[PDB]
């Protein structure tokens, strides 16, 4: 109060220049304070904004993590636990954030809003009513100020005079209300500048407080476990990584010479002592064809399943010329079935017969 | 190892209707897994992208607090200080903020993504190229199984069956790398699933740490002390409102009376024995006019200090009367000036003489 700034209320009804000087101080003042509040909430905004979505997006990733479980993967307990405890943690966390999350729009959002909706519009609305009224009342004036001194009838110059009464007792309660609420600005500037920073500072020391107590040195042990395994798999996987690498190097060398339907009729013997005999064959469309319990067995590389074809150890076989097709043969106790090579051709009417 | 899953690389080379089945059901997989990480990678991605804002919002608003003593405000030691350790405690929790931002990048964000652009990017590669491998070994078979068995050019028949030996070949390995690809993702799966929580996890063992070394018992008494000013100020803020609205409700009163130009002659005496008036006039504009130390002061309610308008007793005044204009005099040792009212009028004329 002592030396706090104030528009003189009592000089309202002189309107002196003067008194219209030091309202421009404070409307310039006021102003600016306009500027840098509005700038301060907008900082603040984004703090309760990226608070809201952090907590969302916390709990979404919590939410993901219990749904694992829940899925119809194609191709195990300890990763389901393993999920279970970052799950629940994740989620304490979460909350964290949801609570900060409520006290900041509480404690700092809604006063800083309140501050720049009702207080700042407040200022804005009684200085246009003020300035009406201060136009209203130059125009009375001047009509009043224009009453002809030789003439002019009374019921005029009563009207014109009365006009002057009404605006300017108008003028001079809307330039009070005005002048009470800048002197009022002088408050709210203070008291909202660090309720905010207040309301905020106490919100992040509960924050920091309800969070660190899920934060034991049994979770770093837990973590420290799973670290562990996680390192173990690496391991694992880079030993299998070998071992396939190896496997694929080895197996390039040993199948280039059988890649060509007719191998080398020295290196590659035909097998004609087999019970068992599975591979591609044409049939006058191409099918895997396979041996099993006396059954010649097919399936289309798109079945699922494949079926019977014909019976087999009891029947006839015989190399057949069906169209003008290479290798092709037929049995009966089926349609024609093509071989890829003579190779070929003979081991399976040789299995077949065996 | 032991009961991992696998595919038989082993039975590339065969390429059975069965082996392409256990293929389908790896894929169907990984398509599966595929879509889980993917929203995993999002909800985390959002994490991160909220953590960034959260820092650079609190970093803002405490860099705002900074300039509020570099201010041009037109209208204070404790209230620059305040701001001060606000804003110094602000800052060390931007920097938390800050810090955890980064962590998370380079131990959550960093992993996932490399899952994702890399890892799931090599299995779509490898099982196009795999695909055409199959298909052009699919043609070259084609054509190799409808060689003319009666006539057929020698150049022909070789160049067809060499097709088969390089389609088959590139078939096969294409296959095996394919293989490969997928039996490591049963690897990488679990730690591309467990790699980013637990980066997660740490980094916010490490941010509520500190975090809360910061929030010491002396900063709450830091708030304890702001918080019991601002309660002060609003005491003191409705203490001067009360008055305020009293002074109006007495001042409108107190007015009323004398809003009219001609004030009642009975109740409000024509003052003659003044050494002091001020008040506006119109000139033939209207400015405002006040005396002092033997001058005649003129002040438009536009201007900014005013000046000289005429000398004072010592000098000759007498009503006037210009054009047809009531209340109007003169001066000289002036412009005409208008009065407003009878009483106004004397009052002028009589203090100017005085």
Known sequence: MPGIDKLPIEETLEDSPQTRSLLGVFEEDATAISNYMNQLYQAMHRIYDAQNELSAATHLTSKLLKEYEKQRFPLDEVMSSTLQQFSKVIDELSSCHAVLSTQLADAMMFPITQFKERDLKEILTLKEV??????????????????????????????????????????????????????????????????????????????????SENLNEQLEEFLANIGTSVQNVRREMDSDIETMQQTIEDLEVASDPLYVPDPDPTKFPVNRNLTRKAGYLNARDRQFYFTQGGNLMS?????????????????????????????????????????????????WICTINN
């Open 130 to 211: 003020f300035q009406i009224a201060s136009n209203d009342h130059d125009a009375a004036i001047n009509r009043y100020s224009r009453l002809s001194k030789k003439r002019e009838n009374d019921k005029v110059k009563y009207e014109v005079t009365e006009d002057v009464y009404t605006s300017r007792k108008k003028q001079h309660q809307t330039m009070m209300h005005y002048f009470c609420a800048l002197n009022t600005l002088q408050y709210k500037k203070k008291i909202a500048l660090l309720e905010p920073l207040l309301g905020y500072m106490q919100a992040q020391i509960s924050f920091f407080k309800m969070g």
């Open 299 to 347: 399936q289309a590389r798109g079945d699922v399943a494949g079926g019977l074809a014909m019976d087999i150890d009891n029947c006839s076989v015989m190399a057949v010329d069906c169209e003008d097709r290479r290798y092709c043969f037929q049995i009966t106790s089926s349609s024609i079935l093509q071989a890829e090579s003579k190779k070929d051709h003979e081991e």
